[PDB]
Amino acid sequence: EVQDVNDSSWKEFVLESEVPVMVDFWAPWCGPSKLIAPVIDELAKEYSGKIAVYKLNTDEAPGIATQYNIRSIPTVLFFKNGERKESIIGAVPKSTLTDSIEKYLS
């Protein structure tokens, strides 16, 4: 399913996870958002307990979207040990996201 994350649950779910985090910055009325969502859902199952996957609604949680200067959407952000590691803009292919997952493991 991939859990959702807000302004109050950011620190915990994302910034403090001991496993690498891939966050999906999306919006209910952005075309491509509908397109990556399945891929982000499939990538969640594939890497259980290996990376942490969360969805962030930019409408619902405008404070974080501002905080990380998220401008184009969807963006996919990567976090290791509360450090902003990577920024991939747009309706990203699964392979590109896959290639990015490996770059952060053991």
């Binding site: 009325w29 952005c30 075309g31 509908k34 998220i70 184009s72």
Partner: protein
């Protein structure tokens, strides 16, 4: 809606006038159009629904991201994937979307 119908028309007319085609997944085209419409309603202008803004209302007055935006008008680059160039793989071959499908995704 009368706004959605107005938005629908602009997308259909503009696509033809620019040699661009809607997504092969029309539900994507539907989402964008409706987002443009919702922005048309609350903001005045059809502000691009595929960006985050620190200030929506100031954004409407600089007009940059007012659809059709600067990138789409000068460089034909549309990241909502409303107006797709022929070489893009997501480009279907419709330049028309049924009024019916636009409400179906509003319910979906």
């Amino acid at each position: 809606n009368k706004t959605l119908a107005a938005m629908k028309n602009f997308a259909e007319q503009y696509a033809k006038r620019t040699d661009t085609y809607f997504c092969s997944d029309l539900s994507v085209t539907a989402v964008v159009i409706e987002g443009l419409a919702r922005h048309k309603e609350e903001l005045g202008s059809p502000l691009c629904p595929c960006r985050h803004y620190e200030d929506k209302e100031a954004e409407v007055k600089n007009t940059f991201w007012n659809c059709p935006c600067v990138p789409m008008r000068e460089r034909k680059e549309c990241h909502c994937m409303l107006f797709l160039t022929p070489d893009n793989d997501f480009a279907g071959d419709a330049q028309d979307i049924p009024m019916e499908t636009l409400e179906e995704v509003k319910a979906s």
